[PDB]
Amino acid sequence: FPATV
Amino acid sequence: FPATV
Amino acid sequence: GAMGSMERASLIQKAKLAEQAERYEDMAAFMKGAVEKGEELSNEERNLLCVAYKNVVGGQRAAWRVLSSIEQKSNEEGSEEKGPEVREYREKVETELQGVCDTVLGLLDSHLIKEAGDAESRVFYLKMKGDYYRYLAEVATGDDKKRIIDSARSAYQEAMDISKKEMPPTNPIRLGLALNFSVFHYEIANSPEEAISLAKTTFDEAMADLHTLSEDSYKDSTLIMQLLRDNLTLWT
Amino acid sequence: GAMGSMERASLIQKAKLAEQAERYEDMAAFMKGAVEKGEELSNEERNLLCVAYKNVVGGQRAAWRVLSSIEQKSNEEGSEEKGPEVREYREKVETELQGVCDTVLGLLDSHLIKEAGDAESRVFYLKMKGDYYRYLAEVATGDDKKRIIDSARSAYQEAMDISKKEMPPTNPIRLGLALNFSVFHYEIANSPEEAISLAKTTFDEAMADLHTLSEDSYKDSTLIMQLLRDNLTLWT
Ligand SMILES: *SCCCNC(=O)CSc1ccc(Cl)cc1
Ligand SMILES: *SCCCNC(=O)CSc1ccc(Cl)cc1
Ligand SMILES: [Mg+2]
Ligand SMILES: [Mg+2]
Ligand SMILES: [Mg+2]
Ligand SMILES: [Mg+2]
Ligand SMILES: [Mg+2]
Ligand SMILES: [Mg+2]
């Protein structure tokens, strides 16, 4: 999964 | 801590 | 609410203890109680709210993905019928996840967003609104799925508009918003080109503003810039 | 009980799904429901029960230790008074932990132990009884603390007596029982010499029996023997 914050 | 199972 | 009898300051203190103990459900319940006192949240208090629910819903999402993968495999050719249990349990986790998202969205709507006037609070809350509609979209399959996706989009877009007018391109909230809206484009809205363009332009505009920053602000901004780069590397 | 309407087999199936999803509270609730159907548990089902509660209570114990350390520091000379919140929250986690232990002990007493006639089931359940009284002892400070410690001791001792009569010295349940009773001696009963002697004698008697085992049984037994060695290295 791609990065999120 | 020591090991337990 | 079960936190109604506890002082605001005590709820915040306990949220910090719960974080140290990795008790994120407790942390979220304490922060919900703090929000429900009705006062605006400081920067630190907004971060505690965010961290608590991010960890709770992140665990639910991870569990939902495990169960959904098992359910998908069960529906492939040659798979033995195992009964309704996988679907039931995936639905159980899904319903709990939706409940958490609805709780967060409820706090934002009653009444955090409407009282948030400074860009740092308003953008933060609108980003969170986009994020929790995005988590609802991840599990959505019904007649309202397009409206859920559009609710996420709309919240992100309002946050983006404010952030571009009111914050420098290195502001960590602005960067994290762009990171997550880019992920929305890629994973939810079937718009990988928009995702890539947003991440690239965000990264480049931040790079050009780093020269204005102290060492500590530079560290904060470059941390999130690296996440943008990581996604671009994944996608290209 | 909320699991009363679900089939036994469905509860077991869902416990396994919950394990794959790292949803150990759910796993424990499913296994509690399965136990409450009233039938004896198979070897695999006993392991699922054990894994579920071990992970739930292990998380609670870790959180309790974090909070207890903060509380201890708050009571040292020169520390600013911060109010009752640390004690309150440590007590909250402690009460939840005690509730989990009481639930497990209740399942063992109603009626798993009394129907367990084979050594592999009876030793396993008596070991668990010792373990959950040990977790209660870890947080105990009241008039009943000596009785809680003695309840752990008594359960472990009954399990030890059966295991030595009825199981080979390499049996993994026998080994894990000895490992944990040795830890009881060291950490609960203020008896480090007994802890060390038990771990050493257990290890040596298992070593002498490894020659009788298949490759797979050897792997199972040596894994637990290494834990005995790890504790001995820690303690000497
Ligand atoms: S739930 C995110 C709030 C906690 N903040 C951090 O972990 C510092 S990094 C950061 C900065 C900006 C944004 Cl929008 C998220 C994380
Ligand atoms: S909660 C412990 C039951 C799960 N069993 C394992 O993880 C295999 S190793 C083992 C063997 C014997 C004992 Cl008493 C505990 C763990
Ligand atoms: Mg009030
Ligand atoms: Mg559903
Ligand atoms: Mg644009
Ligand atoms: Mg029945
Ligand atoms: Mg107490
Ligand atoms: Mg002896």
Burial D135-170 (b: 16+ CB within 10 A, else e): bbbbbbeeeeeeebbebbbebbebbbebbeeebebb
- D58, D25 in Cβ contact below 8 A? no
Q: For residue D148, tell me if it sits in a domain.
A: yes
**Is D2 among the domain residues?**
no
Categorise residue D163: left if φ over 0, alpha if ψ from -120 to 50, beta otherwise.
alpha
- State the structure-solving technique: X-ray
Q: Decide if C3 is inside a domain.
A: no
Q: Is the CB of B5 under 6 A from ligand 2?
A: yes
Given an 8 Å threshold on Cβ–Cβ distance, is B5 in contact with D234?
Answer: no
- At CB < 8 Å, which residues of chain A contact C? 1-5
How close is the Cα of C150 to the center of ligand 5, in Å?
Answer: 16
Does residue D28 lie in a domain region? yes
Give DSSP secondary structure letters for D155-213: HHHHHHHHHHHHS-TT-HHHHHHHHHHHHIIIIISS-HHHHHHHHHHHHHHHHTTGGGS
Domain containing residue C124: 8-235
- CB under 8 Å to C201, separation ≥6 — which residues? none
Report the nearest atom of ligand 1 relative to the CA of C53.
1
Residues D17 and C85: beta-carbon distance below 8 Å? yes
Question: Is residue C2 domain-resident?
Answer: no
The CATH number of whichever domain residue D72 belongs to comes to 1.20.190.20
* Phi and psi at residue C117, to the nearest 5°: -105, -30
| Rg (chain A; Cα; Å) | 5
The answer to whether residue C208 sits within a structural domain is yes
Contacts of C154 (CB under 8 A, 6+ apart): none
Interface of C with A in 124-163 (CB under 8 A): 131
Interface test with D, best of C11, C85, C86, C91 (most D CBs within 10 A): C85
The ligand whose atoms approach the alpha carbon of D128 most closely is 2
Q: What is the resolution of this structure in A?
A: 1.1
Number of independent structural domains in chain C: 1
Alpha helix stretches (DSSP H) within chain D: 8-20, 24-35, 43-74, 85-107, 113-115, 119-139, 145-166, 172-183, 192-207, 215-235
D85 interface with C at CB cutoff 8 Å: yes
Domain assignment present for residue C125? The answer is yes
What residues of chain C lie within 8 A of the CB of A5, using their CB?
A: 176, 179-180, 224, 227
**B1 min Cα distance to partner chain D (Å):** 9
Is cis: bond before C185, omega within 30 of 0?
no
What are the distances in angstroms from CA C27 to CA B1, C34, D82, D143, D227? Answer: 26, 11, 19, 32, 35
How far is C-alpha C76 from the chain's CA centre?
A: 32
- D1 within domain boundaries: no
